[PDB]
Structures are given as structure tokens and as C-alpha cells.
Amino acid sequence: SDAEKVYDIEGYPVFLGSEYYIVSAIIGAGGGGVRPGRTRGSMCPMSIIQEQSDLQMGLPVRFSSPEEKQGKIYTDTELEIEFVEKPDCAESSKWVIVKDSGEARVAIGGSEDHPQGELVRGFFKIEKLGSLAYKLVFCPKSDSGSCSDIGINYEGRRSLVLKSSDDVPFRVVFVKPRSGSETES
16 A cells, blocks of 8 residues: 555566566666775775676665565555675664765665664655656655755765755666575575
């Protein structure tokens, strides 16, 4: 329920709990998928970067919801995101918002990986960006009544950040990884 259903590029619903690559949509600004990446000035890669090549779909993620453990994903509904793999220096691969430079960025790891005061509590949501794309948004807890678009900060590292305006979202589509009898990690 709530709005419209979110589908992968194959036309199938995006399911909570299943693995999906998040890659740049055809109407995007180029590039591939996302993955944890090196943080400028840190030994532990806790930033999220977008691949420069559309040949690289990045690392898969799985979506979860505070209302149901399974089911189809609908736009404009609360979601939490996590990569299916995490660095050993991080306690988790969950996506979080870290604000400590005027400009909030999307990172991985929770309260055990970042100073509490730096994290911004809230939920993610997937919004439809036409019929050829989607975009991710983050809705702060305290800011009850406003969500910021997730966009790319182009600086050679294509890192994911929260945009102040809604004119520069990272346009994406969802791709299910290939499998069969088993999907080792």
C-alpha cells in the first residue's frame, strides 16, 4: 500500500529482504552502481561511492521496513538500507546519514562506527522519477514533514550525499543480481 509499487529493471516488484544493485538510470548522469568506498582521511571505508563505469553495478543492498519483514516495496514508504557485505573495520553495513561538515553525506555503520552526535536519525524512501527512473530520499525524524534527495557529489570520488535542493537527485534503477542454486553472500 501507499502510493505506487517499485519495480526492478526486469519489471518485477522490488522485494524487502532481496538483493538489489542500485545503479544509475538511463536518464542519469552516467556511471554504474554503488559500494562502500574510502573516506578522505580514514583507514576505514565508510563512505558510499558510485562506480564511474556503467559496467560495474557495485555491491548489492537489501531493503527492510519497520512495518513488515516481507513484501513488495511501495514508493514514499519508510525503508532502511544495508549492503550485503561490510568492511571488518565497520560494525555494520547499514546506510546512515552523517553530518559533520555543513554538508550531510550517506555513509555506512551505526552508532558504533560514528560519533552519536554526527548521525541523523530517520528513514529512507524510494520516489518515482518518471517512468524510467527512481530516486532515494532521506526523511529526518525531527524534521517531520520534509525529506532530502540523495544525490552525487562529483569530485572524482562520486560519493553519495544529501542535497539541499530537489533539482539534483541521483537517478537510479534497481537490478537483481544473477543467481541460481545459491548466492554465496
